[PDB]
Amino acid sequence: MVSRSMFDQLFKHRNSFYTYDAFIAAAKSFPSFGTTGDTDVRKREIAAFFAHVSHETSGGWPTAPDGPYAWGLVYIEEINQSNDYCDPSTQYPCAPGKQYYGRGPLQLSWNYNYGPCGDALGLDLLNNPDLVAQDPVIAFKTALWFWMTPQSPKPSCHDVMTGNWTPSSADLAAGRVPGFGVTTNIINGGLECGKGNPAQAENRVNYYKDFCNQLGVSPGSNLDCANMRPFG
């Protein structure tokens, strides 16, 4: 998987909520994560997941010890907790008294994501969304759920990084060629790819390249997403 000492090197300044043991327990619920493909493909997948996590939870600053990519996994909850992040749903009804703001390593948000994520994990996250911010095993599981789960027309980020997604002719025409860039496109491409301001996407790439360097792997091809359109 990832050794404890390597986890503690990549995430040297993290919030101690996010324990290595909790990450390992979560990954055992998604056993193909980081175990798919040859050695370089596995390292790239792990670096890619951790890069996105770090970008979404970073407490870094430009003169921080160990540099601006060493401060991933500092944040648990979204700061502004005034909006409920509730879109009325008959399938995933918003629980009275609860809110669906961002929680965990990939900032799970909205009743319409807490619902299906919870169902897949066997946890009532729709009616107890605060679970994600209480229990680091659950927190990591919500992030791996997102990484590992297709949402047609989008493949899973896992499949993109491990050779299990082959683009259609339309994907290719749109610049969606397998690599790290497509994972940014899946996560938040409507805001960060295409003609969006490229700053956030370029930050994700910088974490990814740094983590690939530490793991001793080439980052591979197609890292940018400015030359690709978000999935329809």
Residue numbers in the entry: 0 to 231
The publication says:
GH19 chitinase hydrolyzes the glycosidic bonds of chitin, namely beta-1, 4-linked N-acetyl-D-glucosamine. One of the physiological roles of chitinase is to defend plants against pathogenic fungi by degrading chitin, a major component of the cell wall of many fungi. We demonstrate that this remote loop directly accesses the fungal cell wall, and surprisingly, it needs to adopt a defined structure supported by long-range intramolecular interactions to perform its function.
To investigate the contribution to the antifungal activity of the 45 substitutions, we constructed mutants of Anc4 + Loop II with substitutions in proximity to loop II. We chose six substitutions within 4.0 Å from Loop II and introduced them accordingly to their proximity to each other’s. Two substitutions, p12K and n13H (small and large character indicates Anc4 and Anc5 state, respectively), formed new hydrogen bonding with Asp73 residue in loop II. The His 13 residue is also involved in hydrophobic interaction with Trp78 residue in loop II (upper left in the enlargement). d197(217)R (residue numbers are responsible to Anc5ΔLoop I; residue numbers in Anc5 state are in parentheses) substitution formed new hydrogen bonds between the N terminus and the tenth α-helix (upper right in the enlargement). n193(213)G substitution reduced structural hindrance with the Tyr76 residue in loop II (bottom left in the enlargement). Mutations A, B, and C increased antifungal activity 4.7, 1.2, and 5.4-fold, respectively. These substitutions increased antifungal activity while retaining the same degree of chitinase activity. MD simulations of these mutants revealed a gradual reduction of loop II flexibility directly related to the introduction of these six substitutions Furthermore, these substitutions decreased only the mobility of loop II not the one of a loop region between the ninth and tenth α-helices (positions 192–201). Furthermore, crystal structures of Anc4 + Loop II + A and Anc4 + Loop II + A + B + C revealed that their loop II structures are retained as in the structure of Anc5’s loop II, namely the antifungal active variant. Altogether, these results exemplify that antifungal activity enhanced by cell wall binding activity is supported by the substitutions that rigidify loop II.
